[PDB]
Design a protein around this ligand. Structure first.
Ligand SMILES: CCCCCCCCCCCCCCCCCC(=O)OC[C@H](COP(=O)([O-])OCC(O)COP(=O)([O-])OC[C@@H](COC(=O)CCCCCCCCCCCCCCCCC)OC(=O)CCCCCCCCCCCCCCCCC)OC(=O)CCCCCCCCCCCCCCCCC
Ligand SMILES: CCCCCCCCCCCCCCCCCC(=O)OC[C@H](COP(=O)([O-])OCC(O)COP(=O)([O-])OC[C@@H](COC(=O)CCCCCCCCCCCCCCCCC)OC(=O)CCCCCCCCCCCCCCCCC)OC(=O)CCCCCCCCCCCCCCCCC
Ligand SMILES: CCCCCCCCCCCCCCCCCC(=O)OC[C@H](COP(=O)([O-])OCC[N+](C)(C)C)OC(=O)CCCCCCCCCCCCCCCCC
Ligand SMILES: CCCCCCCCCCCCCCCCCC(=O)OC[C@H](COP(=O)(O)OCCN)OC(=O)CCCCCCCCCCCCCCCCC
Ligand SMILES: CCCCCCCCCCCCCCCCCC(=O)OC[C@H](COP(=O)(O)OCCN)OC(=O)CCCCCCCCCCCCCCCCC
Ligand SMILES: CCCCCCCCCCCCCCCCCC(=O)OC[C@H](COP(=O)(O)OCCN)OC(=O)CCCCCCCCCCCCCCCCC
Ligand SMILES: CCCCCCCCCCCCO[C@@H]1O[C@H](CO)[C@@H](O[C@H]2O[C@H](CO)[C@@H](O)[C@H](O)[C@H]2O)[C@H](O)[C@H]1O
Ligand SMILES: CCCCCCCCCCCCO[C@@H]1O[C@H](CO)[C@@H](O[C@H]2O[C@H](CO)[C@@H](O)[C@H](O)[C@H]2O)[C@H](O)[C@H]1O
Ligand SMILES: CCCCCCCCCCCCO[C@@H]1O[C@H](CO)[C@@H](O[C@H]2O[C@H](CO)[C@@H](O)[C@H](O)[C@H]2O)[C@H](O)[C@H]1O
Ligand SMILES: CCCCCCCCCCCCO[C@@H]1O[C@H](CO)[C@@H](O[C@H]2O[C@H](CO)[C@@H](O)[C@H](O)[C@H]2O)[C@H](O)[C@H]1O
Ligand SMILES: CCCCCCCCCCCCO[C@@H]1O[C@H](CO)[C@@H](O[C@H]2O[C@H](CO)[C@@H](O)[C@H](O)[C@H]2O)[C@H](O)[C@H]1O
Ligand SMILES: CCCCCCCCCCCCO[C@@H]1O[C@H](CO)[C@@H](O[C@H]2O[C@H](CO)[C@@H](O)[C@H](O)[C@H]2O)[C@H](O)[C@H]1O
Lengths: 97, 63, 126, 55, 36, 60, 55, 459, 170, 171, 62, 55
């Protein structure tokens, strides 16, 4: 039955010893290497890392410590407990029964 | 293998070196902000609640 | 003191009674085994030594092994006393055993917490 | 034992066989007018006597 | 290369039904142009 | 290609008109009925979470 | 233990190198004068290991 | 989310209108730009999520998954473009369209408020993925793989549709913000036992849960490389993401309904790790590694503690890059020897030195070497499950021994020992392959410096 | 540079040098070498940077959150009130985590500072850590991953019920 | 598979090597090695084979009892401490085909001779296969032996991988 | 000799002696020397368990 | 021929020990704890062409 024979495993380095593995055409191959490297590494990985390193107080963890220090300073200076077992004022609650 | 590692090093440094220089000049010639009490009647912008100038700049521009 | 062969320690060939008493129909068997091995060795070498060959000399023996170790298992399965009991013993047995181990542990622990008996003085991370 | 055999059998392999046999029952029909309309009579009778769809 | 169906695979869908049984072993594919 | 775009928009505009009209009618009917049977739609007396009791279910 | 144990491995490495990567002591022997400095460090380390007073 | 949805859609005209020889350059370059802008999503707040509109919101859970999703599209393009080199042009553009459309559905799936909108897109990811497997897979068994994959998902996702629609009838909304304030407790009854199962079984099969996993090794062995990458890196995590959301409305019934699935996961992780020690197919070994790793995620979501949710979030992200890297490492060998048998090409470190370094680094993350985010996530789940029950440490400890065994066994078998004599077409690694590998491991290791951005809302 | 009341430090008591040997102290000469060769060039660099900072002085502020009604005052199913109440609870939850961190830092610093006398000399530090943890545990423990102000309020009301029941039985 | 002679000689060599492991000292080894040889000469001329086989089996039983549990192994023999130590440094010659031209430029003379070897291999292959064809019986070889070159100017069939194999100390 | 025809999915795959690859002759020139296998010879069902890095069945002096 | 890599592994092997020995918290200690274990694996298996070394 009429079916083409299986092709041959082509080696990119055979025709282009400088091949980057991106394309048969050397000119396209070099460009495809450059966009990957420049956008992949020089932009996203470097500038994205710097962007993450300088995020403005991610989820107010810095603010929370500053606020806690303000509350500890105030409470200990007014003879108050630093923290109470009750989150909500019992004056605002009515138990059943 | 050596060609790939030279290419990887070059492109990381292509923007890495300017950023390292840019961060250094900002930290040296601009510096961080000083914590102050909010003056009476003043309403700071949302980006003025952050210390580092790069963090403040991100707040203004994108957030 | 004879040699007690085990599963994980074979009988040495030099102590095997069948190793010495070599008849003739065993010589013919050995020669037929060497014939198969030499026929396959020649077939491999004509490709291994071929100067123009760049690739993988596909091994049907290796393909048969990887195939039997997966695709060929279910079509040869039959639910029966050995296969059902084995699947019964191990498919569900461990799951039930671990369920009662953990259920018993957590029941007992929750009981103490209700009675305020378990010690959680500094337990505030969970 | 578990994966390549029993976990297959208990679900996908048995469900596939059931539907295949239901399909043969449904579609293995003689193609005869007389038989199809006879089942219509049975369906109508069963609808009334057993399920009271007429009530 | 990528496997594509051959004749043996194709003939699985060329019969009068998909699941041959003792009952339907005498069925045949209808005529190509529906004319008998 | 221009007629394909135009025909869809022209027909689609009137389908969107009718769609929005039918949903307006549904709301009209709903609020009139609610207003005609105030006994079935009582303005309920709401409580605050301080007064309401909810069982606590510890996670541990 | 860090001092003399590391020396003992270094000394054995010296002998193993001199005997062409032979690590079996049955194939060694007669090295007391042939490898004087290795012999010295081997004796000192052995006496340090065995608790020779004031090592 | 429109600032990400629209540019994702524009990748389709960009690919179709590109010069015939520049389809891989254009799509890869501009998809990397989309990924760059995805970092703006990290404008998270301590108390509130980032609620863009009535359709889309992002919080600390969806944000890392969105960033991983958008990062993966360019990586998948580079991985695919070699084995598709002899495909005709139109069918290459269609392949890239299936990858772009998958990203479109994924970035809307992770950001939808409405659970029905989440359900619709969650289900729509089936069509591009099934097409990629069954059309561009190499083996005959890719058709069976698609069928198993399709009907496993639907068998569970159709009961979910009924359950979700029922919830909106009673509650009045499926918006996730409303549900946080209108959630009522789920009381015991056979009705709720089956509402719980309907709400959870669809996500369990995606994870997959042990016992409902057999579709996954089958699918990976048959899918192309891009199919394997998205399947392992993101498509598995839809089940984890859905559970983290849907468990909100199932308390307190989860207290006991979770036992059978914790038992399947705790025992299932040991079984699938042990199975990895005897797998002959390299891709199948990595597929069975995913089941063992996701077993921890299932237990972490089910026990519902702040530490386990943080572990689950880190585990899902960490596993995404590691498993995707491992599939790419296996593929690069396959593109040379055209077989998946692990014992075929041995001693590859002698012939491909740098590629062996990627194998070592991927293996060390797979076995959760500290302080990688693979261990950060795993350790957090172990700490939380010890408080759940102290005995769990035995099973988690055993799984860490076996996990190191098959991780290094894979490295030893393929990279070390003696090279196979008759295999003489092992060409040097291409820059495309080395770059593909470094774009997995480098971000994975960089996250060690700022783990908090992958720890989720409970951080 | 930090509030000495929030992060207390006892007064320092260094003994004076009191040699009993005629040999020179190598530490003293290395200390002078370190001062001249390391500390001095480091200090000059800093004063240069601190001078650039003086020319450009600008301020950032600590965000202050006005109090809003809490969950106890919210009517059932009123999302607009519930949202503000439950955002406030989360912010307080974050600050209370940081309060525990401050007290734990004081405890940990005392253990190291007091040396072999830490068990006796850190008694006050240990007591404060014990109390704040008890309060934190009462508030926030066992809520689960899907914690809210509502579940926290429910937990408190259960505690208040048992505490009332004990007093009645007293 | 071995013959009676081969089994006896193999047992003799194995017995002496284990005796060497026990004795250690060369003088003590030389003494007992001669006593062992005397045991083998007591039955050197035993022409009643069935008795000889009994002698061999009893000698192997006497060996298993008396073997050293940790005998000496030459460093590079299987089980030795240097066995396979250098396999990581053995690189197949076909790898040089994938060198960049700038790497091949550093060894102009070496890569010229390499072409002459590749040329010699190509021009030899056709005749090598033919010799094996006509020198092998009908039903494929009965043994693993290979023939020499039967004509001048012919190389022995299947020689490439024996001749160009890596060195024992390749680096 | 195939594995016994119980349910287990062996099919007709040969049952070969349960012996480690460490037991084979290390001096024969194998095609795969590290595995001590020849190209084409039938591979043990549990070969991946009997490689030289894993289970050993060599005779022991005791 | 890989003496350079051998010395890099020895230095890494020492660095992870000093992380272990100076760790003030258990997570940091674990980094050193696992680090020495990995460097042991890489150095013990230095001659990776040898099966007994990988084992
Ligand atoms: C890779 C990740 C890349 C992420 C992106 C980069 C983000 C970033 O820049 O953050 C870095 C961070 C930036 O800090 P920043 O928030 O921008 O500065 C704000 C300050 O308030 C402002 O600080 P400043 O005003 O003092 O800075 C001025 C400084 C220059 O400051 C800089 O800006 C240099 C920053 C380095 C370039 C960026 C990298 O000028 C100097 O005088 C140099 C000091 C030497 C004088 C002699 O700087 C660094 O971390 C530099 C490296 C760490 C410092 C050296 C530490 C020594 C190691 C000892 C600790 C470890 C123990 C030993 C370990 C051994 C193993 C056991
Ligand atoms: C801003 C954003 C910044 C972007 C990120 C910047 C980082 C990327 C730098 C790119 C490097 C460019 C370069 O030229 O590297 C050449 C660099 C060395 O050049 P080469 O001599 O030609 O190496 C070729 C072999 O493949 C070399 O193979 P190898 O075996 O000699 O070394 C590869 C290394 C993999 O690379 C490494 O991990 C570096 C070694 C550790 C430091 O793997 C190992 O050596 C085994 C060590 C892994 C276990 C470590 C034990 C746990 C320690 C835990 C410490 C935790 C700290 C607290 O090559 C590489 O390392 C390849 C991966 C990079
Ligand atoms: C041997 C010992 C050495 C060990 C190895 C080297 C250690 C280097 C330490 C020095 C590093 C410099 C440093 O201080 O770190 C600064 C910081 C950590 O320190 P920092 O948090 O204090 O920040 C410093 C700046 N200030 C002071 C203002 C806070 O590092 C980072 O934050 C970098 C973030 C990297 C993660 C971002 C990845 C983005 C990738 C793009 C996405 C695409 C991938 C897909 C993502 C998947 C989803 C998320
Ligand atoms: C309206 C209210 C009526 C309710 C009942 C509806 C039943 C309608 C059935 C119409 C479909 C008929 C097709 C079919 O069911 O297959 C034919 C089947 C006879 O085949 P069977 O005898 O079972 O084959 C034995 C093999 N050894 O016939 C059957 O046996 C089907 C029996 C269906 C009843 C259940
Ligand atoms: C053949 C193929 C299988 C086809 C399915 C077979 C039917 C199985 C259905 C289970 C029964 C579920 C049910 O009927 O719940 C009804 C219940 C009615 O409510 P009621 O109890 O009257 O009181 C509350 C009023 N709101 O409604 C409820 O109150 C809650 C209902 C929640 C929605 C349930 C969704 C379907 C449940 C079945 C799926 C669960 C199993 C998942 C299996 C997946 C396998 C991968
Ligand atoms: C507790 C939880 C325990 C978890 C059990 C994990 C079980 C894993 C068993 C290995 C699984 C197979 C992986 C491959 C390992 C292998 O097969 O290698 C065998 C290797 C052979 O080494 P060897 O014979 O010495 O050298 C050959 C040179 N001719 O030798 C090996 O490397 C394997 C030898 C180790 C086998 C385990 C030994 C028992 C350890 C468990 C008990 C520990 C109890 C704690 C200690 C007591 C308390 C003080
Ligand atoms: C490493 C390169 C990275 C590139 C990306 C970063 C680019 C931006 C770098 C920072 C730019 C300068 O950063 C910016 O400095 C000025 C300080 O004058 C601050 O601005 C503030 O102080 C100045 C006075 O100096 C006043 O106008 C006013 O009080 C206020 O606007 C900004 O809050 C800060 O964001
Ligand atoms: C529990 C939730 C998920 C449950 C999912 C259950 C639905 C079924 C999912 C799998 C769908 C497979 O659908 C169908 O199954 C049968 C096997 O049963 C496959 O058939 C395959 O197995 C049979 C029997 O081993 C072989 O004879 C056949 O050569 C092979 O093709 C079909 O190729 C496939 O089209
Ligand atoms: C949670 C419930 C999920 C329900 C999902 C329902 C999916 C149903 C899919 C179709 C089921 C029937 O599909 C059909 O099954 C049979 C048996 O498996 C397959 O048949 C295959 O196995 C049988 C028996 O092993 C062989 O006789 C047959 O030669 C072989 O081809 C068919 O190739 C497949 O087309
Ligand atoms: C009334 C409303 C009508 C709305 C229609 C809006 C779009 C109209 C498009 C008109 C231009 C079409 O352009 C026609 O098709 C393509 C792309 O353009 C061109 O040919 C193209 O080949 C390949 C794509 O295969 C591309 O590299 C390149 O874009 C171009 O060379 C044809 O040479 C041109 O004849
Ligand atoms: C990871 C990096 C991602 C890079 C993304 C690249 C695309 C960048 C898109 C930038 C969009 C900026 O869009 C515009 O920027 C200017 C400053 O220039 C801002 O300018 C304004 O910001 C804030 C608004 O609260 C105020 O201080 C004031 O109104 C003004 O400063 C605008 O708020 C914004 O409308
Ligand atoms: C992977 C598979 C996982 C399967 C998990 C199986 C979980 C089994 C859950 C059992 C609990 C079901 O819910 C249970 O229903 C019974 C009814 O029978 C309810 O019981 C209610 O009706 C019964 C009548 O039978 C009354 O006696 C009882 O007074 C009343 O409370 C319980 O309120 C509830 O506890």
């Amino acid at each position: 039955w009429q079916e083409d024979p299986e092709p041959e495993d082509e080696n990119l380095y055979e025709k282009n010893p400088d091949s980057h593995g991106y394309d048969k055409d050397p000119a396209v191959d070099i460009w495809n290497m450059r966009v990957v490297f420049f956008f992949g590494f020089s932009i996203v990985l470097v500038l994205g890392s710097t962007f993450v390193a300088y995020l403005p107080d991610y989820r107010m963890q810095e603010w929370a410590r500053r606020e806690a220090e303000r509350l500890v300073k105030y409470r200990e200076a007014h003879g108050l407990p630093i923290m109470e077992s009750n989150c909500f004022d019992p004056s605002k609650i009515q138990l059943p029964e | 293998d050596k060609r790939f590692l030279k290419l990887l090093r070059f492109y990381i440094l292509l923007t890495g070196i300017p950023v390292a220089i840019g961060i250094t000049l900002i930290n040296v010639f601009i510096g961080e902000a000083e914590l102050a009490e909010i003056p009476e009647g003043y309403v700071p912008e949302h980006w003025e609640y952050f210390k580092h100038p790069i963090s403040r700049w991100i707040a203004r521009t994108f957030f | 003191p004879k040699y007690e062969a085990s599963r994980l320690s074979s009988l040495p060939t030099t102590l095997d009674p069948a190793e010495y008493d070599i008849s003739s129909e065993t010589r013919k068997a050995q020669a037929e085994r060497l014939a198969i091995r030499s026929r396959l060795k020649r077939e491999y070498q004509l490709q291994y030594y071929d100067p123009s060959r760049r690739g993988v000399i596909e091994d049907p023996a290796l393909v048969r092994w990887t195939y039997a170790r997966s695709a060929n298992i279910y079509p040869n399965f039959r639910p029966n006393t050995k296969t059902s009991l084995l699947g019964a013993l191990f498919g569900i047995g461990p799951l039930v055993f671990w369920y009662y181990v953990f259920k018993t542990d957590r029941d007992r622990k929750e009981k103490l917490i209700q009675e305020g008996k378990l010690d959680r003085t500094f337990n505030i991370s969970y | 034992l578990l994966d390549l055999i029993w976990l297959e059998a208990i679900l996908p392999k048995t469900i596939s066989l059931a539907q295949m046999k239901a399909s043969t029952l449904v579609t293995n029909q003689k193609g005869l007018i007389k038989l199809y309309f006879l089942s219509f009579l049975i369906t109508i009778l069963i609808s009334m006597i057993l399920f009271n769809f007429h009530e | 290369r990528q496997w594509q169906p051959d004749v043996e695979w194709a003939e699985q869908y060329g019969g009068a039904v998909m699941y041959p049984t003792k009952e339907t072993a005498h069925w045949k594919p209808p005529p190509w142009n529906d004319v008998d | 290609q221009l007629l394909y775009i135009t025909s869809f928009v022209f027909v689609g505009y009137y389908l969107l008109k009718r769609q929005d009209y039918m949903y307006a009618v549904r709301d009209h009917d709903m609020f009139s009925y609610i207003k005609s049977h105030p006994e079935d739609f009582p303005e309920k007396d709401k409580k605050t979470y301080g007064e309401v009791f909810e069982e606590f279910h510890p996670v541990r | 233990h860090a001092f003399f144990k590391a020396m003992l491995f270094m000394c054995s490495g010296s002998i193993i190198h001199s005997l062409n990567d032979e690590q079996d002591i049955r194939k060694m022997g007669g090295l007391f004068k042939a490898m004087p400095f290795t012999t010295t460090a081997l004796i000192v380390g052995s006496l340090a290991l065995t608790g020779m007073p004031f090592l | 989310m429109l600032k990400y949805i629209i540019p994702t859609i524009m990748l389709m005209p960009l690919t179709w209108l590109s010069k015939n020889n520049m389809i891989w350059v254009n799509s890869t370059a501009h998809s990397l730009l989309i990924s760059f802008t995805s970092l703006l999503l990290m404008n998270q707040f301590g108390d509130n999520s980032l609620n863009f509109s009535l359709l889309f919101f992002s919080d600390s859970l969806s944000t890392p998954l969105l960033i991983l999703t958008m990062w993966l599209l360019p990586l998948m393009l580079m991985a695919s473009q070699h084995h598709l080199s002899k495909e005709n042009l139109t069918r290459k553009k269609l392949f890239i369209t299936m990858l772009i459309s998958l990203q479109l559905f994924l970035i809307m799936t992770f950001t939808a408020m409405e659970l029905i909108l989440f359900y619709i897109l969650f289900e729509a990811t089936l069509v591009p993925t099934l097409i990629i497997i069954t059309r561009w897979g190499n083996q005959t068994e890719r058709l069976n793989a698609g069928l198993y994959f399709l009907f496993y998902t639907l068998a569970g996702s159709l009961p979910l549709l009924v359950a979700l629609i029922y919830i909106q009838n009673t509650v009045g909304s499926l918006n996730f913000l409303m549900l946080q304030y209108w959630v009522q407790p789920v009381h015991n009854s056979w009705s709720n036992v089956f509402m719980w199962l309907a709400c959870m079984m669809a996500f369990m099969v995606k994870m997959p849960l042990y016992g409902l996993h057999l579709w996954l090794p089958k699918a990976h062995v048959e899918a192309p490389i891009a199919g394997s990458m998205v399947l392992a890196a993101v498509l598995l995590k839809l089940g984890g993401y859905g559970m983290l959301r849907i468990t909100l409305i199932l308390n307190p019934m989860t207290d006991f309904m979770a036992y059978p699935f914790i038992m399947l996961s705790l025992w299932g992780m040991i079984m699938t790790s042990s199975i990895c020690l005897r797998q002959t197919d390299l891709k199948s070994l990595i597929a069975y590694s995913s089941v063992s790793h996701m077993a921890l995620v299932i237990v972490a979501i089910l026990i519902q503690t702040p530490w386990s949710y943080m572990g689950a979030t880190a585990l899902m992200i960490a596993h995404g890059l590691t498993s995707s890297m491992l599939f790419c490492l296996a593929n690069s060998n396959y593109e040379r020897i055209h077989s998946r048998t692990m014992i075929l090409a041995r001693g590859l470190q002698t012939l491909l030195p740098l590629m062996a370094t990627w194998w070592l680094l991927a293996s060390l993350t797979n076995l959760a070497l500290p302080p990688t985010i693979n261990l950060i996530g795993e350790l957090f789940v172990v700490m939380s499950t010890f408080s759940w029950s102290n005995i769990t440490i035995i099973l988690m400890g055993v799984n860490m021994v076996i996990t190191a065994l098959y991780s290094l066994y894979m490295l030893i078998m393929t990279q070390r020992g003696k090279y196979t004599y008759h295999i003489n077409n092992i060409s040097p690694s291409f820059t495309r392959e080395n770059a593909l590998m470094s774009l997995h491991i480098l971000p994975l290791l960089l996250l060690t410096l700022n783990p908090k951005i992958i720890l989720g809302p409970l951080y | 540079s930090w509030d000495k009341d929030v992060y207390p430090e006892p007064p320092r008591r260094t003994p004076a040098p009191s040699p009993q040997t005629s040999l020179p102290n190598p530490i003293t000469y290395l200390t002078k070498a370190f001062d001249l060769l390391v500390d001095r060039p480091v200090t000059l660099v800093r004063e240069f940077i601190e001078r650039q900072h003086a020319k450009n002085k600008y301020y950032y502020y600590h965000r202050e959150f006005r109090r809003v009604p809490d969950i106890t005052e919210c009517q059932e199913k009123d999302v607009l009130c519930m949202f503000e109440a439950e955002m406030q609870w989360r912010r307080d939850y974050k600050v209370d985590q940081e309060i525990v961190n401050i007290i734990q830092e004081r405890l940990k610093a005392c253990q190291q500072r007091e040396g072999e006398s830490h068990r006796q000399n850190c008694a006050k530090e240990l007591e404060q850590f014990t109390q704040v943890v008890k309060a934190y545990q009462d508030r926030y423990h066992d809520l689960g991953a899907h914690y809210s102000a509502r579940k926290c309020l429910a937990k408190q009301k259960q505690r208040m019920l048992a505490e009332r029941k004990a007093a009645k039985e007293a | 598979y071995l013959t009676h002679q081969q089994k006896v000689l193999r047992l003799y060599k194995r017995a002496l090597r284990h005796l060497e492991s026990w004795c250690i000292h060369r003088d003590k080894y030389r003494y007992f090695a001669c006593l062992l040889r005397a045991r083998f000469d007591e039955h050197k001329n035993e022409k009643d084979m069935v008795k000889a086989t009994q002698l061999l089996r009893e000698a192997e039983e006497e060996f298993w009892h008396g073997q050293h549990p940790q005998p000496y192994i030459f460093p590079e023999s299987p089980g030795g401490t240097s066995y396979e130590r250098y396999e990581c440094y053995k690189v197949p010659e076909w790898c040089l085909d994938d060198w960049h031209p700038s790497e091949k430029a550093m060894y102009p003379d070496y890569f010229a001779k390499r072409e002459q070897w590749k040329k010699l291999r190509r021009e030899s292959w056709e005749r090598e296969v033919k010799q094996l064809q006509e020198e092998t019986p009908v039903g494929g070889p009965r043994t693993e032996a290979l023939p020499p070159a039967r004509k001048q100017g012919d190389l022995p069939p299947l020689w490439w991988h024996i001749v160009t194999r890596p060195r024992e100390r390749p680096m | 000799e195939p594995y016994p025809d119980d349910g287990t999915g062996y099919g007709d795959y040969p049952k070969l002696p349960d012996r480690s690859q460490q037991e084979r002759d290390p001096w024969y020139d194998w095609d795969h020397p590290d595995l001590r296998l020849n190209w084409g010879e039938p591979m043990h069902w549990d070969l991946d368990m009997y490689i030289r890095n894993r289970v050993d069945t060599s005779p022991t002096p005791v | 021929p890989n003496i350079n890599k051998f010395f890099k592994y020895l230095l890494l092997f020492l660095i992870t020990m000093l992380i272990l020995v100076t760790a003030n918290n258990l997570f940091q200690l674990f980094i050193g704890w696992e680090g020495v274990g990995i460097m042991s694996f890489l150095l013990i298996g230095w001659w990776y062409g040898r099966a007994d070394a990988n084992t």
